[PDB]
Amino acid sequence: GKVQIINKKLDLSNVQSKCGSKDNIKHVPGGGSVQIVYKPVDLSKVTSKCGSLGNIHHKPGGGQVEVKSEKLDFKDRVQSKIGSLDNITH
Amino acid sequence: GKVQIINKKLDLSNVQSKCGSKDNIKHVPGGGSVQIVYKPVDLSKVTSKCGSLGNIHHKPGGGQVEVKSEKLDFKDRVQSKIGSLDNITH
Amino acid sequence: GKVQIINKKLDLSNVQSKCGSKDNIKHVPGGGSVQIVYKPVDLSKVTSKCGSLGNIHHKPGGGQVEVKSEKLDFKDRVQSKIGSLDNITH
Amino acid sequence: GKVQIINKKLDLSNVQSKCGSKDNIKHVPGGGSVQIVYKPVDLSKVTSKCGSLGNIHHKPGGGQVEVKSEKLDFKDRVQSKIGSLDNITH
Amino acid sequence: GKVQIINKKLDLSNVQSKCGSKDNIKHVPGGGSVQIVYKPVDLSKVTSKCGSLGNIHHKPGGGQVEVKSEKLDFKDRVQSKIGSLDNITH
Lengths: 90, 90, 90, 90, 90
Fold this sequence. Notes:
Five copies of one chain form a homopentamer.
Chain A: E1 3-11, E2 14-17, E3 22-25, E4 34-37, E5 41-48, E6 51-53, E7 56-58, E8 65-89
């Protein structure tokens, strides 16, 4: 007889989204009208290791039947609108 | 028989959204109308190790029936409106 | 027989959203109307180890029936409105 | 028989979207009406190790039936409108 | 028999979209109406290791039936409109 199944996994990984940002609005000496709309919609999403992982089945036997159905269904919708922006000097 | 199964998993891993950020608004000496709408919607989502993981089934049957349905549904809907902004100087 | 199953899992992981942030509003000496609308909606969500994990089943049966349905449903809806902002100087 | 299966996997991997960004608006001393609409919709999505991974099956059966369906559906919809912006000087 | 299967994989990899960026609006001293609509839609998507990977099956059967369906559908739809912008001087 004898059967021998060995799985060795080392995961060191680095998964990132928007990790390091610098954002500035500086120095406005003007004396006229200044209008700024700075990033209306700023999203980030991260999915990792979602589904079916690392499972073990030990199932010896002659006449067995099996029916699996896996579905993953990811749906985003982002909707935006910028209207009347009025900026007037003298 | 003498069946042997080994699963050695070592995990060192970094998963991140928006981890480091420096943000500034500075130095307004103008005397002129200043309007700023800063990042209106800012959403960060992280999902990890969802659904089925690290499960052991030891199940020896000669005539065994197994049915499994596994469905993952992930929906995000975002809606932003910036309809009327008025800026006036003098 | 002597069937043997071993599953050694070690987890060290950093999972994070918006973990370090420096945020500042400074130095307004103008004498002219200043309006600032900072982030009206700011959301951070983290999910980990959801559904089924680390579960052990020992179930030897010659003629056994098993049915399983597993649904994880994650729905998020965000709605933001910035209808009227007015800034006036002199 | 004496069947042997070995799976040694080592992963060091960096996955990133928009990791470092320096963004600035600076030095407006003009005295003339200034309007700026900065990046209105800004989305970053990262997905890794989704669906089925690292699963071990030991299943010796003389006359066995196995049926599987696996469906991955990822639909993203983005809709942006910037209808009326007015900048007027003197 | 003495079947031996060995699968050693070492992964060192960088996968990135928009990793480093310096972006600036600077020095507006004109005194004449200035209008700027910066990148209206800006999207980054990274997907890795989706579907089936790293799965071990030991399944010796004399008369065995196996049926498998695997479908990956990735649909993205993007729509941008910029209808009426007015800049007036004197």
